[PDB]
Enzyme design. Structure first.
Site, short mmCIF file in Angstrom:
data_model
loop_
_atom_site.label_atom_id
_atom_site.label_comp_id
_atom_site.label_asym_id
_atom_site.label_seq_id
_atom_site.Cartn_x
_atom_site.Cartn_y
_atom_site.Cartn_z
N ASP A 11 -3.84 6.20 -1.25
CA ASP A 11 -3.02 6.58 -2.39
C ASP A 11 -3.94 6.57 -3.60
O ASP A 11 -4.29 5.51 -4.12
CB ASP A 11 -1.85 5.62 -2.55
CG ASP A 11 -0.90 6.02 -3.65
OD1 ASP A 11 0.09 5.27 -3.87
OD2 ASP A 11 -1.13 7.08 -4.30
N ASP A 15 -1.76 11.31 -2.01
CA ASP A 15 -2.46 10.73 -0.87
C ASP A 15 -3.35 11.78 -0.24
O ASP A 15 -2.87 12.87 0.11
CB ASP A 15 -1.47 10.18 0.15
CG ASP A 15 -0.46 9.24 -0.47
OD1 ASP A 15 -0.78 8.04 -0.61
OD2 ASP A 15 0.64 9.70 -0.83
N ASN A 34 -3.22 8.02 -6.45
CA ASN A 34 -2.37 7.95 -7.64
C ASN A 34 -2.73 9.02 -8.67
O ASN A 34 -2.71 8.79 -9.87
CB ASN A 34 -2.39 6.55 -8.26
CG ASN A 34 -1.16 5.72 -7.85
OD1 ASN A 34 -0.03 6.13 -8.11
ND2 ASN A 34 -1.39 4.57 -7.19
N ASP A 71 8.46 5.61 0.17
CA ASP A 71 8.56 6.75 -0.74
C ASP A 71 7.30 7.62 -0.73
O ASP A 71 7.25 8.63 -1.44
CB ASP A 71 8.90 6.31 -2.18
CG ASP A 71 7.98 5.25 -2.70
OD1 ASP A 71 8.11 4.87 -3.88
OD2 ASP A 71 7.13 4.79 -1.91
N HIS A 72 6.29 7.25 0.06
CA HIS A 72 5.26 8.17 0.50
C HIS A 72 5.46 8.46 1.98
O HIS A 72 6.10 7.69 2.70
CB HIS A 72 3.84 7.61 0.32
CG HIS A 72 3.53 7.14 -1.07
ND1 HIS A 72 2.44 7.60 -1.77
CD2 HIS A 72 4.13 6.22 -1.86
CE1 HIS A 72 2.39 7.00 -2.94
NE2 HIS A 72 3.39 6.14 -3.02
N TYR A 109 -6.10 1.99 -2.66
CA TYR A 109 -4.81 2.07 -3.33
C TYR A 109 -5.15 1.98 -4.81
O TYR A 109 -5.28 0.89 -5.37
CB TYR A 109 -3.89 0.95 -2.87
CG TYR A 109 -2.59 0.84 -3.62
CD1 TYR A 109 -2.09 -0.39 -3.99
CD2 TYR A 109 -1.86 1.98 -3.95
CE1 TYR A 109 -0.90 -0.50 -4.67
CE2 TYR A 109 -0.67 1.88 -4.62
CZ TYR A 109 -0.19 0.63 -4.98
OH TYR A 109 1.00 0.51 -5.67
N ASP A 127 4.46 1.04 1.02
CA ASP A 127 5.23 0.52 -0.12
C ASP A 127 6.12 -0.66 0.30
O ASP A 127 7.34 -0.66 0.15
CB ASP A 127 6.07 1.63 -0.76
CG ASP A 127 6.48 1.30 -2.17
OD1 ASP A 127 6.29 0.15 -2.60
OD2 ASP A 127 7.00 2.21 -2.86
N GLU A 171 -0.42 -0.49 -0.53
CA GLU A 171 0.74 -1.15 -1.13
C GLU A 171 1.52 -1.95 -0.08
O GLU A 171 2.74 -1.80 0.08
CB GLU A 171 1.63 -0.15 -1.86
CG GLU A 171 2.38 -0.77 -3.03
CD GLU A 171 3.19 0.24 -3.84
OE1 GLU A 171 3.05 1.46 -3.59
OE2 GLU A 171 3.93 -0.18 -4.76
N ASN A 181 0.86 5.03 2.61
CA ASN A 181 1.37 4.04 1.66
C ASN A 181 2.75 3.63 2.16
O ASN A 181 3.70 4.41 2.10
CB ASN A 181 1.43 4.56 0.23
CG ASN A 181 1.83 3.47 -0.79
OD1 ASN A 181 2.71 2.64 -0.54
ND2 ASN A 181 1.18 3.48 -1.96
#
Length: 275
Positions: free
Chosen positions: A167, A240, A169, A265-266, A128, A28, A54, A26
């Site tokens: 991801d 993930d 989540n 941030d992953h 995602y 992001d 993302e 990810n």
């Protein structure tokens, strides 16, 4: 509190050398990740297949620096019709036999979250999964997506063995995040979301690749909020995953968490299989 990912096992239990290396990340925000040298990391990791989630970048604003990966020259992209709020990508050394996008209900929706790529001996899905949102404002949408996704994957993996990455989540169990008890009512660790992931593993069925090899390893995370210094204090979640058909466990050489790799941030995750 900290975590050091074990060294890469490049041989299967049966004793075969890994022949396929898949990395999922990810990013992001693909364009910012590219400026923070993500492609430099990928070139060093040298995966056969790279999956990205993302992206938050339309198909037309994709930096041609991605063309500078001839080791991953076949590139497929899934951007939303509405939103940069989501979006995913899949790059591979070899062309997939067939590539598809979505999970079947693209009428009135088409969110850009899933690519399905069929290869010679397996089917790879990258996803995602919708975040249930701050204060669970999107949790109802998340539950309906979970249902559709399980149904869609069921009618997918009855043909070839499946790898699913991305991801997702959700932190499955309490051993998957740093604050279980302060987070049971937060997106990623609600009882409903943990239930959907359990149902995912049950119904397809899939095995969690990392936890299959490290059932008892704590503090192994792939996401840390940018806020505070959660990455430095390893206040993280494992959102993930590489999920595998049981057919594929004898090919499973290792499933990595690339904790040190910056740009999001992953962090990336990497799978080795002996195919």
């Amino acid at each position: 509190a900290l975590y050091e990912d074990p060294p890469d096992q490049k041989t299967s239990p049966s004793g075969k050398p890994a022949t396929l290396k898949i990395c999922s990340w990810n990013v992001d925000g693909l364009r910012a990740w590219i400026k923070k040298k993500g492609l430099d990391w990928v070139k060093e990791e040298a995966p056969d297949i790279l999956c990205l989630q993302e992206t938050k970048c339309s198909e037309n604003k994709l930096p041609a620096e991605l063309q500078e990966l001839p080791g991953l020259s076949h590139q497929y992209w899934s951007a939303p019709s509405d939103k940069g709020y989501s979006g995913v990508g899949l790059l591979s050394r070899q062309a997939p036999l067939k590539v598809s996008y979505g999970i079947g209900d693209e009428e009135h929706d088409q969110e850009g979250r899933v690519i399905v790529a069929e290869f010679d001996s397996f089917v790879l899905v990258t996803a995602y999964v919708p975040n249930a949102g701050r204060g669970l404002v999107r949790l109802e949408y998340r539950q309906r997506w979970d249902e559709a996704f399980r149904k869609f994957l069921k009618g997918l993996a009855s043909r070839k063995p499946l790898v699913l990455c991305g991801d997702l989540n959700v932190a499955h169990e309490e051993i998957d995040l740093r604050n279980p008890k302060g987070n049971k009512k937060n997106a990623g660790f609600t009882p409903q979301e943990r239930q959907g992931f359990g149902e995912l593993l049950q119904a397809v069925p899939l095995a969690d690749s990392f936890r299959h090899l490290y059932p008892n390893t704590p503090y192994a995370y792939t996401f840390w909020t940018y806020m505070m210094n959660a990455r430095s204090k390893n206040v993280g979640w494992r959102l993930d995953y590489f999920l595998l058909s049981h057919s594929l466990l004898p090919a499973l050489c290792d499933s990595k968490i690339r904790s040190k790799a910056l740009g999001s941030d992953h962090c990336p995750i990497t799978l080795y299989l002996a195919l």
